[PDB]
Ligand binder design. Structure first.
Ligand SMILES: CC(C)[C@@H](O)C(=O)N[C@H]1Cc2ccc3c(c2)[C@@]2(c4cc(F)ccc4N[C@@H]2O3)c2oc(nc2-c2nc(CO)co2)[C@H](C(C)(C)C)NC1=O
Ligand SMILES: Nc1nc2c(ncn2[C@@H]2O[C@H](COP(=O)(O)OP(=O)(O)OP(=O)(O)O)[C@@H](O)[C@H]2O)c(=O)[nH]1
Ligand SMILES: Nc1ncnc2c1ncn2[C@@H]1O[C@H](COP(=O)(O)OP(=O)(O)CP(=O)(O)O)[C@@H](O)[C@H]1O
Ligand SMILES: Nc1nc2c(ncn2[C@@H]2O[C@H](COP(=O)(O)OP(=O)(O)O)[C@@H](O)[C@H]2O)c(=O)[nH]1
Ligand SMILES: [Ca+2]
Ligand SMILES: [Mg+2]
Lengths: 437, 417, 50, 298
């Protein structure tokens, strides 16, 4: 049993973390006070769920998690939260003044002063780890803390835990809920600095989540609460293999092995189905072939883009609930002839499949219907590069006029770090381009 | 936290400022005695941003009232909500400034300034995490303009990394007041360009036009104008006084509104003008609805922050917004993607239920500054009324300097259109 | 269906259809940013002193 | 108030379409690189599809089908017909074709065909003098009379966002044939005339003898790649006008020659066709205040 430490950074990472950890407790049957009756071993054990939960001699199951933010408003919501008894004070790190949506502020000014403290609380966790695999890092692209401080923490984590894996869950900026005009700046800056430091990153485009929340869940103006509950489901199905008995992706390193042939191209596209509205809890029960076919419909992707116009280099299918291998094979055979699925030449046209018999858990009073079977497909297609392009374009529009740049220079960042990061991205776009056709 | 320290200076500053505290007291549920009588406990959530708490559940406006003559501030003290201000936060002189920037900035102002900063320093010492400062004043006069800007320079020196915000009433040739307004406004604009992060620009010519043409008021008074201003001051501070994600604090607002450091002069707008969604959205974006003279169609918008307030679909608000972004179309810069942001607050202003507030960083404001520049030049070349300034020790060169600083500002706006 | 692993929680298989910065370097870049801030702020205060 | 942008000034058809749109008042043309638009009349090459359908509260339509270049490239069309089971060797309306690159491809296999009348084109008679795509030349074309003159059929096809395949009822024949000058006006023979000829000379109609195969070929080609380029559940919608080029041989068999993704139009047919494009392609997604199309069902 190798442990995993989850690190939640800034508002998005924090609020999403809370939604995820709530779900984990429900999935593992853990009470909001840390008690878990289902657990027969008291004071410890090497069970699968111990990769995410420590155990105190008193029987409290404590998340291997650390929440960090430069403003106390969001962390406090965790302290007064339903699952507050889970966490202890050392896990929640909070500053006084935030990064004001300024990458330079999160990275250089504020970051420098709080980095050691965050590392100490992180070390306190690792110190309780028999065989730490590495870290799961949640954060947004657009925020000053999520972009600026995350990149610094990643740089340090590489130094202090050299032989440990780091995966990200990154929230990609969408103006439909975006709170800042400089998010394209912060995005490129943090992607540039984190790139050589992240083994595998799952981008989630708020545009996609927001749209799914409207179309599938019938919601006029989706809340972060609404978005974060859907995001937590997907994160849950991506992490399920680390928390339950299995053979597919039981280690953080297996994630890069199966999904990332090329180090720099480490952003797999996630697609999820089915998403049903709970208010109408009388719906038709989708089949294995149907939810599988839905993974290739752009409208269920975490990032809106067209996989038909790129190449795959790895594809993993994660099923939850009532599913046997027999049906998956039939569903894949029929879909292959039916849809445009083109792998890179130096890769076998193959699908890795995992099935967890336990059906997806829903939060009570939530917005999602419970379903007897769901699937999350992780696929490394070059099509996701569309996102990088979109983002680089908006960056170029502003930077040509040096708009908002003085805010960054004023924090001690040199202007050269902009053109440095943008060149790195142009290079990245080229890498997808090469692989893509 | 995060607390804002409010400073109001001069006649205009204190009269506009006093009304502002009236309207937002009435929104946070604070009575003229400082007791809370609000129905929703949602008002109390961000109350700390503008109020200190004392014994006996008393809420006291973190505000400093400053003048060089006792007049206006005795009028505040005797006015409604007069007693809610700390007695000790009244700082005033006896000599007056005589509408003279030099007196406000260099002589009479200098004698009073330190004791103003003593009050400022004691209000800040009581802040868990001080956010910055908000100054209300006019530019046309002597105390608000001259001593207001001296204050800003002092504040900056002591609090170098706090946001400095101001609501600044500019003079117009349409509205006759002191003959030396062009001198005072010009000397002040340079101060603002250097030492504030955000300046809301309004002038009485535009507020007059609104009160006259829109509100059908034959002959407007200070009372009528200040009603508009106080309402607009409530709107653009909505995002600071109630829970929300967009423009949460001053620094984040500044980061989203200010592409280039020197261009931080905003034109505010309000709807409905007080004496449907599409109608409400149409007004606030209307040219004849701006709080300053310049026509927004003469330039482009670098950034726009719209705050809707009340109970509304917001589905349609998103619709109406984009209907404006495309109906105008030509008036938004294309090199700042998604430069129009929309915020929404549930609690509507007193007696409206529905409301909107416009905040535009428009290059069209350059006309405002060019106009004042031409006035200043017309006078300065004849050296008319100049002896009131050199009499206080000012050099002619300092005038030539502020003139070209002005033209520089007008030129910088010119680059971006 | 190659590599079919099976347990009480589920099963997994595979279908085939066709065949950096050190601690000092980080510290330096951080401290450099700090120096530039301090310089920028020193220039402001000198200006305010004049 | 709908907004559009033009990114191919070189397009004559959408020059009209832009004229009509503006002439309806309910359409305002934005600056070429303005992100906030409803309809894009996109550029002929490297159209930035990845940036479409990403504007909040804005339904965006584009007049091109991404990926439709497989059916509009010489080497592509061969690769598609000889790969798609929908077509494959079970395709007898498209000439024996092989593709080769200039010094992998099909240069060695083309030989066995020529070895086993062998007039080919890429124009030439013998093989060796051709090396300096290869498709067997229709040595037995359908010569019009009088004049003994060759011709090709041009039909315009409109595929909307719902992927309805519309055949514009007006086609065009783009007119001495030596086995082994202009002036009909402008070498253009419209359907009413060509139908009359085929009736007098050959005792058949344009509909029976040629149009049936045309419609067949249209349906088959576009239906083949429909799963690759449809925008049914895409975050943006697209339509596109196609120019199919056919040839008719001696025994009235229709052959597919070309597929043009940026076709022009016969001058008389410009107004009527572009108007239809607006009505069927643009106004159908963006409403306003008899049919010139034959929809091939599927
Ligand atoms: C088109 C028209 C706008 C233009 O011809 C013009 O300049 N009119 C001046 C006339 C004027 C000039 C100077 C001046 C006042 C008025 C002035 C005034 C009038 C009094 F009876 C007693 C004191 C004062 N102080 C003010 O000083 C004033 O000006 C305007 N409002 C007020 C005022 N309102 C109040 C009530 O709150 C007191 O004073 C308004 C106002 C600033 C527009 C609200 N100004 C005027 O009416
Ligand atoms: N999906 C999702 N997105 C969020 C959430 N909170 C914020 N965001 C997005 O994150 C981006 C803003 O970054 P934040 O996380 O709020 O900023 P931060 O990391 O806290 O850094 P600061 O500037 O110091 O506040 C915007 O694009 C938001 O839309 C959330 O709870 N869920
Ligand atoms: N196999 C074949 N037999 C006889 N004629 C042929 C032929 N292939 C092509 N042609 C002749 O080629 C002419 C049209 O050529 P083609 O369609 O290739 O244009 P093009 O490739 O030069 C550019 P575009 O696609 O825009 O027309 C027709 O008039 C037709 O007679
Ligand atoms: N809107 C508004 N403007 C005012 C008010 N009082 C004065 N002014 C304007 O302010 C300018 C005069 O400056 P003033 O504040 O009176 O002088 P000060 O006391 O030295 O700062 C003129 O342009 C007046 O029109 C007021 O109550 N409301
Ligand atoms: Ca245990
Ligand atoms: Mg924050």
């Amino acid at each position: 049993m190798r442990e995993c430490i989850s690190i939640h950074v800034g508002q998005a990472g924090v609020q999403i973390g809370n939604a995820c950890w709530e779900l984990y407790c429900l999935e593992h049957g853990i009470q909001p006070d840390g008690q878990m009756p289902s657990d027969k071993t008291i004071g410890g054990g090497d069970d699968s769920f111990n990769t995410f939960f420590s155990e105190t001699g008193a029987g409290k199951h404590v998340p291997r998690a650390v929440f960090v933010d430069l403003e106390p408003t969001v962390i406090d919501e965790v302290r007064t939260g339903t699952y507050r008894q889970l966490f202890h004070p050392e896990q929640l790190i909070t500053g006084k003044e935030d990064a004001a949506n300024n990458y330079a502020r999160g990275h250089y000014t504020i970051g420098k002063e709080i980095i050691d403290l965050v590392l100490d609380r992180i070390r306190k966790l690792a110190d309780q780890c028999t065989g730490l695999q590495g870290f799961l890092v949640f954060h947004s692209f657009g925020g000053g803390t999520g972009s600026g401080f995350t990149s610094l923490l990643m740089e340090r984590l590489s130094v202090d835990y050299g032989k440990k894996s780091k995966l990200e869950f990154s929230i990609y900026p969408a103006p439909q809920v975006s709170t800042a005009v400089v998010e394209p700046y912060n995005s490129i800056l943090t992607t540039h600095t984190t790139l050589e430091h992240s083994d595998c990153a799952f981008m989630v485009d708020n545009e996609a989540i927001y749209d799914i929340c409207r179309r599938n869940l019938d919601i006029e103006r989706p809340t972060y609460t609404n978005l974060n509950r859907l995001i937590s489901q997907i994160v849950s199905s991506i992490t399920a293999s680390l928390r339950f008995d299995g053979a597919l992706n039981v280690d953080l390193t297996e994630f890069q092995t199966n999904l990332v042939p090329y180090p720099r191209i480490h952003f797999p596209l996630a697609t999820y189905a089915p998403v049903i509205s709970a208010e109408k809890a009388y719906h038709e029960q989708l089949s294995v072939a149907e939810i599988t076919n839905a993974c290739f419909e752009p409208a269920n992707q975490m990032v809106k883009c067209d996989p038909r116009h790129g190449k795959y280099m790895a594809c993993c299918l994660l099923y939850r609930g009532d599913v046997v291998p027999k049906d998956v094979n039939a569903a894949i055979a029929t879909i292959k002839t039916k849809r445009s699925i083109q792998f890179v030449d130096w890769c076998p046209t193959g699908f890795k499949v995992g099935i967890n018999y336990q059906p997806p858990t829903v939060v009570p009073g939530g917005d999602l219907a419970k379903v007897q079977r769901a699937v999350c497909m992780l696929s490394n297609t070059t099509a996701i590069a569309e996102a990088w392009a979109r983002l680089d374009h908006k960056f170029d529009l502003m930077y040509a006029k040096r708009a908002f740049v003085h805010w960054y220079v004023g924090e001690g960042m040199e202007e050269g770090e902009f053109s440095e990061a943008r060149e790195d991205m142009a290079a990245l776009e080229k890498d997808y381009e090469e692989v893509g056709v | 936290m995060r607390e804002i320290v409010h400073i109001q200076a001069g006649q205009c500053g204190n009269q506009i400022g006093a009304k502002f505290w009236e309207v937002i007291s009435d929104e946070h549920g604070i009575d003229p005695t400082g007791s809370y009588h609000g129905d929703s406990d949602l008002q109390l959530e961000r109350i700390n941003v503008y109020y200190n708490e004392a014994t006996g559940n008393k809420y006291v406006p973190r505000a400093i009232l400053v003048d060089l003559e006792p007049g206006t501030m005795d009028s505040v003290r005797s006015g409604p909500f007069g007693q809610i201000f700390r007695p000790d936060n009244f700082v005033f002189g006896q000599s007056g400034a005589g509408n003279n920037w030099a007196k406000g900035h260099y002589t009479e102002g200098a004698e009073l300034v330190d004791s103003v900063l003593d009050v400022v320093r004691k209000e800040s010492e009581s802040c868990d995490c001080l956010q910055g400062f908000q100054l209300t004043h006019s530019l046309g006069g002597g105390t608000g303009s001259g001593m207001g800007t001296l204050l800003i320079s002092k504040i900056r020196e002591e609090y170098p990394d706090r946001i400095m915000n101001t609501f600044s009433v500019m003079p117009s040739p349409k509205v006759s007041d002191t003959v030396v307004e062009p001198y005072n406004a010009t000397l002040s604009v340079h101060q603002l360009v250097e030492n504030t992060d955000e300046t809301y620009c309004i002038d009485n010519e535009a507020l007059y036009d609104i009160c006259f043409r829109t509100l059908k008021l034959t002959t407007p008074t200070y009372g009528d104008l200040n009603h508009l201003v106080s309402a607009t001051m409530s709107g653009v501070t909505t995002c600071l006084r109630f829970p929300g994600q967009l423009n949460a604090d001053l620094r984040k607002l500044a980061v989203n509104m200010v592409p280039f450091p020197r261009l931080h002069f905003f034109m505010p707008g309000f709807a409905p003008l007080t004496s449907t969604v599409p109608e409400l959205t149409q007004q606030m974006f209307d040219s004849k609805n701006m709080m300053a003279a310049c026509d927004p169609r003469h330039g482009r918008y670098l950034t726009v922050a719209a705050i809707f307030r009340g109970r509304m679909s917001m589905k349609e608000v998103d619709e109406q917004m984009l209907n404006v972004q495309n109906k105008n179309s030509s008036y938004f810069v294309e090199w700042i993607p998604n430069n129009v942001k929309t915020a929404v607050c549930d609690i509507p202003p007193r007696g409206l239920k529905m409301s909107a507030t416009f905040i535009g960083n428009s290059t069209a404001i350059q006309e405002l500054f060019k106009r004042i520049s031409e006035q200043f030049t017309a006078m300065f070349r004849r050296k008319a009324f100049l002896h009131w300034y050199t009499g206080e020790g000012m050099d002619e060169m300092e005038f030539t300097e502020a003139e070209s600083n002005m033209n520089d500002l007008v030129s910088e706006y010119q680059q971006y259109q | 269906v190659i590599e079919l692993n099976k347990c009480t929680s589920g099963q997994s298989f595979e279908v085939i259809l066709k065949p950096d910065p050190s601690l000092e370097e980080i510290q330096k870049k951080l401290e450099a940013a700090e120096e530039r801030r301090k310089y920028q702020e020193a220039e402001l205060l000198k200006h305010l002193a004049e | 108030m709908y907004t559009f942008v033009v990114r191919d000034e070189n397009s004559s058809v959408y020059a009209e379409v832009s004229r009509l749109l503006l002439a309806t008042g309910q359409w305002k043309r934005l600056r070429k690189d303005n992100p906030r638009f409803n309809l894009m009349l996109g550029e002929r090459n490297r159209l930035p599809f990845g940036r479409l359908g990403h504007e909040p509260g804005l339904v965006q339509l584009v007049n091109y089908y991404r990926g439709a270049d497989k059916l509009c490239r010489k080497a592509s069309l061969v690769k598609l017909i000889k790969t798609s089971p929908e077509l494959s060797e079970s395709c007898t309306w498209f000439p024996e074709s092989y593709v080769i690159y200039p010094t992998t491809d099909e240069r060695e296999v083309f030989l066995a065909a020529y070895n086993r009348g062998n007039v080919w084109i890429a124009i030439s008679s013998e093989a060796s003098e051709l090396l300096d795509v290869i498709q067997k030349y229709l040595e037995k074309p359908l010569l019009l009379e009088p004049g003994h003159r060759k011709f090709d059929i041009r039909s315009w096809v409109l595929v909307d966002h719902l992927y309805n395949i519309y055949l514009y009822r007006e086609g065009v024949l783009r007119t001495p044939y030596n086995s082994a000058n202009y002036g009909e006006e402008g070498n253009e023979m419209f359907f009413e005339e060509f139908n009359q000829y085929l009736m007098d000379a050959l005792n058949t109609t344009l509909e029976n003898s040629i149009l049936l195969q045309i419609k067949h070929i249209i349906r088959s080609c576009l239906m083949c790649i429909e799963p690759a380029i449809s925008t049914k559940h895409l975050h943006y919608q697209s339509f596109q006008l196609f120019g199919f080029d056919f040839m008719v041989d001696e025994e009235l068999k229709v052959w597919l020659i070309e597929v043009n993704g940026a076709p022009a139009c016969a001058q008389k047919l410009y107004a009527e066709l572009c108007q239809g494009i607006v009505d069927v392609a643009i106004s159908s997604v963006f409403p306003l205040a008899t049919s010139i199309f034959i929809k091939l069902h599927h």
